[PDB]
Structure 1
Amino acid sequence: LGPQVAEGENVFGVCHIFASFNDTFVHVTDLSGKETICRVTGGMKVKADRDESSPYAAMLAAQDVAQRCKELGITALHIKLRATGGNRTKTPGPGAQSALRALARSGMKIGRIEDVTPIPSDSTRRKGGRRGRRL
């Protein structure tokens, strides 16, 4: 069920970890990034908008993704981590670290980590007003 690769060699795919403050996306796709293998989110595991971005939902999503990818023959993963970016926050949400550790403990081999978040040169106007959000 996948490529024919010797025991010593590992098949590589990239994993996009979109860690917003509303939920977390774990999205494994090919090295080229065009064909996807498993994409499950934190909202697909917890039925409560509160916990959509919790570390627990990210852990469950990462475990599901790692299991499906192992069933599909990929043993090594390339991690690229993204925050919301744009004019909004640049710090990744709480689910990123939990998802990374979850897919590490799931037997997956770890490639090289990279931080790919949209960093505007000089963006448009941020959503909040001149006085900003007041809550």
Structure 2
Amino acid sequence: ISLGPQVAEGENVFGVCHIFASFNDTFVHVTDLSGKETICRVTGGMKVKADRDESSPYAAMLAAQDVAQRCKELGITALHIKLRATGGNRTKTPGPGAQSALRALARSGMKIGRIEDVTPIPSDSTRRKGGRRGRRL
């Protein structure tokens, strides 16, 4: 009770932290083991007011700090990790904010379980956007 479980000191409570780090944003999202219920979702957009640093490591660590204090306030100790890129037909590698957010989560008084990749990997995707001649910059 009191915004927390009745777990003993010897046992730790396990959550699931989806880190959807794409380009131009970074989502850190803590849920239960099934993922049905969500505790807190913080993203770099609500921590930098520049519209350019949404995927910045400076904003990513701040977002991870907020979900860390919220998890500790809710009495959550151990936390699995599910790293996710944009996926689909689009880019399959995680954005810049993934490493800073993960480092912040470890150092801000949290425990780490298993790390897994939940990137959407198609067997063979649809027509990816851009044209056959690519994005001419």
TM-score range, shorter chain: over 0.9
Post-superposition shift, 1:6? 1.0
* TM-score, normalised via structure 1 length: 0.98
Post-superposition shift, 1:134? 0.6
Post-superposition shift, 1:102? 0.2
The aligned counterpart of 1:19 is 21
* TM-score, normalised via structure 2 length: 0.97
For the residue of structure 1 that corresponds to 2:53, the secondary structure is: helix
Could you tell me which runs of 5 or more consecutive residues in structure 2 were left unpaired when the two chains were aligned: none
For the residue of structure 2 that corresponds to 1:62, the secondary structure is: helix
Post-superposition shift, 1:79? 0.2
Residue 76 (structure 1) aligned with residue 78 (structure 2): yes
Measured in 2, the distance between the counterparts of 1:118 and 1:48 equals 29
For the residue of structure 2 that corresponds to 1:50, the secondary structure is: coil
Could you tell me which runs of 5 or more consecutive residues in structure 1 were left unpaired when the two chains were aligned: none
Post-superposition shift, 1:92? 0.1
Can you list the C-alpha shifts for 1:82-131, whole angstroms capped at 9, x where unaligned?
Answer: 00001110010000010000010011000000011000111111101010
Q: Which of 33, 46, 49 is the matching residue for 2:48?
A: 46
Measured in 2, the distance between the counterparts of 1:35 and 1:87 equals 28
Matched residue count: 135
Can you list the C-alpha shifts for 1:31-79, whole angstroms capped at 9, x where unaligned?
Answer: 0000000100011100111100001111000000010010001011000
The aligned counterpart of 1:85 is 87
Measured in 2, the distance between the counterparts of 1:26 and 1:114 equals 15
Cα RMSD between the aligned structures?
0.6
Post-superposition shift, 1:8? 1.6
Q: What percent of counterpart residues are identical?
A: 100
Runs of 4+ in 1 over 2 A off after TM superposition: none
For the residue of structure 2 that corresponds to 1:52, the secondary structure is: coil
Can you list the C-alpha shifts for 1:14-47, whole angstroms capped at 9, x where unaligned?
Answer: 0000011010000000000000001000111001
Post-superposition shift, 1:9? 1.1
